[model samples]
Target: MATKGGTVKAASGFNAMEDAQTLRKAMKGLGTDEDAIISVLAYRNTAQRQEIRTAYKSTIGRDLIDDLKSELSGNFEQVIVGMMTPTVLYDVQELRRAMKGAGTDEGCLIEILASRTPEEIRRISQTYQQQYGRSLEDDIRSDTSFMFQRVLVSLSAGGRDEGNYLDDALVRQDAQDLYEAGEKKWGTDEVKFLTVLCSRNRNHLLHVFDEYKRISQKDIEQSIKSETSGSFEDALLAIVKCMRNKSAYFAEKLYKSMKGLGTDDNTLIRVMVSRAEIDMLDIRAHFKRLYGKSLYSFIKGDTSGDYRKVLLVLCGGDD
Candidate 1:
């Protein structure tokens, strides 16, 4: 069983029913042995977690998420429950959580919308409506304004072309369009930038990156820095960088989450859970090259307690 990438994996001696019993035993007796919960929940990948959910409810006759909710609290609970939720649904919950109260967490919005497959984003929008009483767009519209609003709405449409086939002419055309939108005009036309970034496939966008430089004497991202500011700037920057490589984009997100005063625990929890079954190994590799320390080491140094324990297990290994 040589699955590549991602930190988490299906357990070697996998049995979903046994997992249900083990978790029930851990939570049922004494004070919660969080260490038991961490080792058991953290190693199982998403599919195995789903199986555990099914088995737990059938054999135990109660919901796994609800039981965990009653048994655990704080950031530790978030990771364990997040682990149980299917990935796409977790994304919907994260998006709503980002927007729900006070000011929005724009970085959360940008990271998810910028990095996910168009199909997933599209599905998320559908699920968002069914799960929440309101439309996802309406909620986003209510929370944001101006270019930031426009950029997110376009991104949330989830209409980007995914075809690997590239067009020689389209890349230059996009480059020229980008030049005209920014360098040619005295003021920026953010709509053009958003359209290209949202619509083009990653390979096409890479060609556009160079061609824009050839014509405009500016890298597309450099132009973005000059043209925009605030969350809008961050939104475009994430789109371009993620287009370049999702793993590298995410490594930077994890780095930013851990680097500053009192770790960005929500961001830390989100990335650790969201990437554990995806490109996390590649993200870990990128973190070592980009930051000169393993993400594992960074997590160890930055966080403490059971929160740190769960994060390290999801992280799986060091560089």
Candidate 2:
């Protein structure tokens, strides 16, 4: 139920060169053709968008990102640039941005590090080193504190066992161990929670969660909520939600991004752009199911102008 990928893909007979000029024309004229820019990017997959960037550099002889940045402003510009950025590197940028600001955006850090696969994390770590000459692990350690730091450091190691295989009896023990480690103990065993959550595959972890709830007479979300505080609590809960259903987790995120008096544009841009080609269809379904509103319509009311248009297009069609 949780495995559908992005709704968008590159078009057939696809040529990045043609789209390159489309973007160029958007930036060339007087007011910046926002419609043209959105059309070029919104429906395309990540590679196609990145390809447009490369071709733009070759044809226009200037960096596409810099050119677009000059032409557009605000969230519209931000999301547009996010679309054109190379994938792993964009993730690196988000990770770095989260850590660099005055107070660390611990939620953003937890979201990416918790949800992304181990292999993806490995490449992201390498990309951070390549781009920033700093260690993701080391930087996160400096940016966060205590058990929160521990979870981030562990996730940054990028060694999650991704196999679908599960051990039935061992899963039961993991549940029991987690039960003893958190619910039954005077104080939570941070290491036990860390060990089981970090080491197991999603399929196995799902089983562990099931057995965990049954054995403890409460859901892990409930137990973790009652047992911990701060970013550590956030990380543990985020991982389990992801393991339960990534799209569902994303649906809640998308809702929160738009729910308030002001928007969380970083999350708005990041989730929409990143998931556009992966699990967005499922996210849309989950959104309506959980929130009783179409993401398309909710966005329609929440934002205005070119930015809203781009978001709606990426949302595809109303569910």
Candidate 3:
């Protein structure tokens, strides 16, 4: 189960500076109520986080962080603060801080960088410049060495595909080329496979698929499985599979994670939590399209106890 993004109505009855004061007054007089704190902050999105900052500044006449420190303590406090900032800004800043001076935290670098979309990375890199007055890529180069630096730099250069959104005629031409490279040509071209899959937007990809059917008479996923293998092949297959139907991709990920001897608690937890607020409704629809069973039913069958309870709440069900 996952939480949903709160509905945004224009924030009424408060301004920024004043909101800070209201929070300060709450902290100063009543003391920190953990339940109240979590209730207010736990489900907020990026936009709400921005609004909170505004309210805090107008009310308290001090930074939200400084005011928070005055009230909360330890790791809980840290979690709250971290949650308040933009995810990308917080991650880049944290990675830089971790890798600075003597030691490096490569684990942090690898996990965060390798997984995020190019659009996500771009936003974060932009935030790093705004917040720290330095280039994120430059910081990565300074702190890391050799192959690691190259990987991070390539990531920082925004490796994620920006889906092609050219005109319908040009899109079909590119789609034909993609089909030729991946399906009709003597050997499979991984670059062309990645380029078309990653660069084309979902709507454009649908058009491409129509064009592909016209030329090759087979779905892209089938073509890839027939032609390619290894990690790059797997990645290409995932792109084609996902592009064909993102919900099916997620449903497959969900099914595989739970199919084995032991559940992938991390994947189970991450996908549910992440999509709950982001594009979960889309995922739910996808799951329905791909699998006859509902995602909610899968979750109910697979999870139990307090973890299930909390996840259910996040998913908008009573536990």
Q: Which of the numbered candidates is closest to the native, going by highest lDDT? A: 1
Steric clash pairs (candidate 2)? 5-279, 6-277, 6-278, 6-279
lDDT of 2 by residue, 1-319 (tens): 5576676778777788899889898878678888888887886777887888889889888898898899889999898888888889999999999999688998889999988989999999999999988899989988998889999999998888878998899999999998998889999998889878987898999999889888888998898899898889989999998899888999999999989798888998899888888889999999999989999988888889999998887888896
Give one digit per residue, the lDDT tens place, for model 3 in 1-319.
3432322223455344544444565676665655545545554554576688877776555677777767875445555566565656666666676567886655445534544567877887888888778888888888876544655666565665465564788667876887778677888765666666655566687777777777788876677778776434555555566556554565566666666576665455544544445556556665656667666676667776434543443344311
TM-score of decoy 1:
0.96
Q: Is candidate 1 or candidate 2 better by lDDT?
A: 1
Model 3: lDDT equals 0.61
Per-residue lDDT tens digits for candidate 1, residues 164-279, read 77899999899999898898899998899999999988888998899999998888888999988999999999999898888889899899998878788888898989988888
Give the TM-scores of the predictions, in the order they appear: 0.96, 0.96, 0.58
Residue pairs with clashing backbones, model 1: none
> In model 2, which range of ten residues has the least summed lDDT?
1-10
Model 3 bad stretches (over 4 Å): 1-85, 89-119, 127-169, 241-248
lDDT of each: 0.89, 0.88, 0.61
